[PDB]
Ligand binder design. Structure first.
Ligand SMILES: [Cu+2]
Ligand SMILES: [Cu+2]
Ligand SMILES: [Cu+2]
Ligand SMILES: [Cu+2]
Ligand SMILES: [Cu+2]
Ligand SMILES: [Cu+2]
Ligand SMILES: [Cu+2]
Ligand SMILES: [Cu+2]
Lengths: 80, 80, 80, 80
């Protein structure tokens, strides 16, 4: 990514790999190694993502928020 | 939250999202993004919560304790 | 414990909670909050434990080793 | 390993234990404590590995990449 990957990856049901980066983004990578999407938070994503029953991806950020991202990379909500 | 979310979220059986914050609290957030409760420890919650078979939430804190929280946010025990 | 709990807990099949501490120990805590045992490594246990199919607990340490502990707290092996 | 093990281990279906090290390698250790292989990245492996449905091991590195390693230790891809 653009910075250290301290975050630990999570794997979705279709094999998508989600991981944060110190570059501030949450990455969704296809199992073939090509980017599916990236979502920008306001600070390093050290937190490791979790996947809910409906596929929502949750991850914290050093920007103080817990993010809930939809599987298509669009923000569901953020909690401060 | 009030500080960086380094902690990695855990998801309960009803979809509740639990995560620590450097603001010293463990947060329980409803799947709609509204706060269910927060529990205050005495230091940053870098540790990532785990959920036991009965729903108890366990998480460490920089205050030296491992906390066991009930699903309703009331302390079960803390271990130093 | 004796220092910050940065490690993230793991839960065994009988509900035992395993977590590292910056005090250098891996802790096994009974679901009632009483200590089952502690195992001493040579440096902070920031790593979060994993539990194998036979119940062995694996965790890293800042002492450079990956530890394999038996469920009774006796060392199985360490790898440097 | 050659440096602190901050990474948290993952366990494969055959019991292999995967963990990163600040020495820059991802380690695959057999359940008997003998090395199965190690894979070198370009910086500390603080990230904790995840295992996909086909056994691929994914882990981040402070070198900015998310790595996808095959179960035999050969690189599948890396994503920057
Ligand atoms: Cu860098
Ligand atoms: Cu930044
Ligand atoms: Cu801040
Ligand atoms: Cu503080
Ligand atoms: Cu202290
Ligand atoms: Cu020390
Ligand atoms: Cu060292
Ligand atoms: Cu280095």
């Amino acid at each position: 990514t653009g910075g250290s990957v301290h975050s630990s990856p999570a794997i979705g049901q279709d094999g998508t790999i989600y991981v944060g980066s110190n570059d501030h983004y949450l990455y969704a990578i296809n199992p073939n190694g090509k980017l599916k999407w990236k979502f920008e938070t306001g600070g390093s994503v050290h937190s490791s993502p979790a996947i809910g029953q409906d596929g929502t991806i949750y991850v914290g950020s050093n920007d103080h928020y817990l993010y809930a991202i939809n599987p298509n990379g669009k923000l569901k909500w953020k909690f401060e």
